[PDB]
Amino acid sequence: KEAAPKCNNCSQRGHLKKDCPHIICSYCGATDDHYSRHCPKAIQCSKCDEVGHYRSQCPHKWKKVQCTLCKSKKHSKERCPSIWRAYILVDDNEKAKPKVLPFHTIYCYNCGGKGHFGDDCKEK
Ligand SMILES: [Zn+2]
Ligand SMILES: [Zn+2]
Ligand SMILES: [Zn+2]
Ligand SMILES: [Zn+2]
Ligand SMILES: [Zn+2]
């Protein structure tokens, strides 16, 4: 903060002597730098006071990544297969044995099941 003047008359707001005649937002900035292209680059970083605290001038805090190797901004477990709790693209269930099937039994109770030529394909 370090303000010698603090205000021209009102004694309670961020607009010092030469700041008070200008339409400067109540704690954003100084009229020496604060402008319609420079509003976020002035005295304070956010809703909390000054750029003058915390490393990287108090950056915005994202909700972090769901993965623990990946750290920054991107994706979720359904978009990142590269974690051992996700499913693999191998050894999944599929069809087998693409060949013709065996023949059926029909052999008149004399040489298998029941069916053919029983009039003469008989001995006893
Ligand atoms: Zn004032
Ligand atoms: Zn502003
Ligand atoms: Zn801050
Ligand atoms: Zn990941
Ligand atoms: Zn037979």
Swiss-Prot record:
Keywords recorded for this protein, A-Z: Metal-binding, Nucleus, Phosphoprotein, Repeat, Zinc, Zinc-finger
Keyword flag Zinc: yes
Gene Ontology biological process terms from the UniProt entry: nuclear mRNA surveillance of mRNA 3'-end processing; nuclear polyadenylation-dependent CUT catabolic process; nuclear polyadenylation-dependent rRNA catabolic process; nuclear polyadenylation-dependent snoRNA catabolic process; nuclear polyadenylation-dependent snRNA catabolic process; polyadenylation-dependent RNA catabolic process; RNA fragment catabolic process; TRAMP-dependent tRNA surveillance pathway
Zinc finger (CCHC-type): 5-22, 43-60, 106-123
Sample GO molecular function, one term: zinc ion binding
Main location: nucleus
GO cellular component, one term: TRAMP complex
Localization per Swiss-Prot or TrEMBL: Nucleus
Coiled coil: none
Subunit details: Component of the TRAMP complex (also called TRF4 complex) composed of at least HUL4, MTR4, PAP2/TRF4 and either AIR1 or AIR2. Interacts with HMT1 and NPL3. The interaction with NPL3 requires the presence of HMT1. Interacts directly with PAP2.
Further remark: Present with 1800 molecules/cell in log phase SD medium.
Family as reported in the entry's similarity comment: Belongs to the AIR1 family.
Protein task: Component of the TRAMP (TRF4) complex which has a poly(A) RNA polymerase activity and is involved in a post-transcriptional quality control mechanism limiting inappropriate expression of genetic information. Polyadenylation is required for the degradative activity of the exosome on several of its nuclear RNA substrates like cryptic transcripts generated by RNA polymerase II and III, or hypomethylated pre-tRNAi-Met. Both complexes polyadenylate RNA processing and degradation intermediates of snRNAs, snoRNAs and mRNAs that accumulate in strains lacking a functional exosome.
Name of the featured protein: Protein AIR2
Organism the protein comes from: Saccharomyces cerevisiae (strain ATCC 204508 / S288c) (Baker's yeast)
Organism lineage: Eukaryota, Fungi, Dikarya, Ascomycota, Saccharomycotina
Gene label: AIR2
